[PDB]
């Protein structure tokens, strides 16, 4: 994203990627269910399992 | 030759004229040593290397071929998690100033 | 080593671990990368503080 | 003070060129035994050993024991400088040159002022060998040549009855085997399976100036390093030793 | 300032730097050479370099200071002011000033 800033290109629309779905799987999981989880990362396992049981 | 003892070389180059306003000549004797060794001079009498450039700011102790008691004696002692660094398979920040080198540049600077 | 003084490339470089949702979503309105440069981290960020050399 | 003198000045000097192809800078030991020399080449791919006994000159009278450094290319030039029926006398006196005349017809003498070779001593002792055979050079040097001509390097597998060497490369591939019933064998003896691969430029350089019908023995090992000999006047002998590959 | 791993590893870098100078600078007096002592010295921050390379002598400091009020452009521009002025010593012409003030400002904002 640093290229675009240095040669000031306008953004271009995004193609769909598994970076994208994540958190839209997580926010939709929040937003459902109420759990907070993060990618990229460790979470705690109180979530984790609840997230399992729910899905 | 008498001086440095190297007497078996068969060839020597120099240049047809220095290009300084001194014209000060280098001594002989490390031509005979660079030509016995075969490396060569540059314009300001040092030897170089030329290679392209890329960046890298995380490594793998695997990628580069160095063991982690090696890494930890040059001061590496955590990956960039937080964890300790006992695996080679875990991911190292680099310093600002530790560059990788080729290995045709490894074979020359020997 | 100061990145204060090395270059002005470099500090448009990110930082972060992963882009945003917002990023994602102003990038179907064609914005320009000046709109959202404070919501991406990048090295110009940091200048001044001491985790220059820190983490990235 | 010592004085050396030697019969056929021919074979001294293609004996030297031989010995000078590897090496550059050279240091001979003079003893009552007999001169002697052991030097190895820039890479220490290859160790040359060079014996000549007190037998073999016709003329010998050494009182004492001192190296002498001489310029493997003067040497050469001069020695070859010879002919077939020559009479070479190697001089040296108090002063710090060495005198080399060749009597023939008429007396010719050449000067070489002697220089400071830093002496490095190394030597290898006999090793495990598993596998030895004798052949001709006229055989190996053609082996040889026609490998270099497909690879650039050279295999040695040998077996019971068998000597069999080959050479790989990217689209083209030559083998060469006999057996003891062939005259290019005279003689073999096995240990085990053997297999081994060395470069084919120093091979080249070694196996130069072979000639007809001379008897070489070869001795060599699992990935361990190769060893040829041959005698001059069946008491004098040079050996090479070369590292394998891998 | 820096924490307790990068300062350790300047620390470090520094002391290998200085174990190879001081063989460079033993070899070197000995006279086999056209000078007497090493010829690349050693800079650490922007004001070392320009002092090193175009001078005048003493402007580091200066730099260093007018870096730390205003910034670097209105650091160049006062330091132009204080060469035009004579505060590191007299030249000569007209023509002396203005090649050194350009200079040091082209190095400068450089």
């Known amino acids: 994203f640093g290229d675009f800033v240095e040669n000031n290109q306008t953004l271009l629309p995004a193609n769909y990627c598994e970076e994208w779905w994540i958190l839209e799987f997580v926010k939709a999981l929040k937003e459902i269910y109420e759990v907070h989880l993060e990618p990229f990362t460790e979470n705690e396992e109180e979530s984790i399992e609840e997230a399992s049981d729910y899905l | 030759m ?89 991911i190292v920040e680099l310093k600002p100033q530790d560059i990788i080198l080729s290995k045709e540049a490894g074979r020359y600077l020997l | 080593l100061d990145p204060r003084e090395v270059d002005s490339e470099v500090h448009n470089m990110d930082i972060v671990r992963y882009y945003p949702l917002e990023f994602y979503e102003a990038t179907y309105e064609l914005k320009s990368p000046k709109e959202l440069v404070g919501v991406i981290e990048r090295v110009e960020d940091r200048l001044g503080k001491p985790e220059m050399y820190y983490g990235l | 003070p010592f004085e050396i003198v030697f019969e056929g000045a021919k074979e001294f000097a293609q004996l030297i060129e031989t010995a000078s192809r590897l090496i550059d800078e050279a240091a001979f030991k003079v003893t009552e035994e007999g001169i002697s020399m052991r030097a190895m080449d820039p890479s220490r791919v290859v160790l040359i050993d060079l014996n000549l006994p007190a037998s073999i000159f016709s003329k010998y009278e050494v009182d004492g024991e001192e190296t002498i450094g001489v310029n493997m290319d003067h040497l050469k030039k001069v020695l070859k400088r010879g002919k077939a029926k020559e009479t070479l006398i190697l001089r040296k006196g108090e002063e710090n040159f060495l005198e080399i005349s060749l009597q023939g017809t008429a007396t010719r003498t050449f000067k070489l002022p002697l220089i400071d070779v830093e002496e490095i001593e190394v030597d290898l002792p006999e090793l495990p060998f598993t596998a030895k055979v004798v052949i001709l050079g006229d055989v190996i040097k053609e082996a040889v040549k026609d490998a270099s001509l497909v690879s650039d390097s050279m295999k040695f597998i040998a077996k019971e009855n068998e000597f069999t060497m080959r050479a790989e490369g990217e689209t083209q591939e030559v083998e060469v085997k006999l057996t003891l019933e062939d005259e290019g064998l005279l003689d073999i003896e096995v240990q085990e399976e053997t297999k081994s691969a060395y470069g084919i430029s120093y091979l080249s350089d070694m196996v130069k100036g072979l000639g007809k019908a001379d008897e070489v023995t070869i001795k060599f090992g699992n990935e361990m390093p190769m060893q040829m000999e041959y005698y001059i006047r069946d008491e004098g002998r040079l050996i090479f030793l070369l590292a394998p590959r891998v | 300032e820096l924490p307790k791993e990068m300062e350790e590893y300047f620390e470090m870098l520094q002391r290998e730097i200085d174990k190879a100078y001081e063989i460079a600078k033993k070899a070197r007096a000995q006279g086999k050479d056209p000078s007497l002592d090493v010829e690349i010295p050693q800079a650490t921050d922007m004001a070392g370099r320009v002092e090193s390379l175009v001078g005048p002598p003493g402007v580091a400091k200066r730099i260093r200071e007018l870096v730390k009020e205003y910034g670097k452009e209105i650091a160049a521009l006062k330091i132009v002011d204080e060469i035009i002025e004579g505060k590191f010593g007299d030249l000569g012409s007209r023509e002396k000033y203005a090649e050194q003030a350009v200079r040091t400002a082209l190095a400068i904002l450089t």
């Open chain 2, 2 to 90: 008498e001086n440095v003892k190297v007497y078996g070389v068969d060839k020597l180059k120099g240049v047809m004229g220095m290009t300084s306003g001194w014209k000060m000549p280098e001594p002989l004797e490390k031509g005979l040593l660079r030509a016995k060794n075969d490396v060569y001079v540059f314009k300001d009498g040092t030897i170089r290397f030329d290679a392209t450039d890329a960046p890298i700011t995380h490594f793998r102790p695997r990628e580069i071929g160095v063991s982690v008691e090696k890494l930890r004696e040059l001061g590496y002692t955590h990956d960039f998690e937080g964890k300790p660094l006992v695996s080679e398979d875990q």
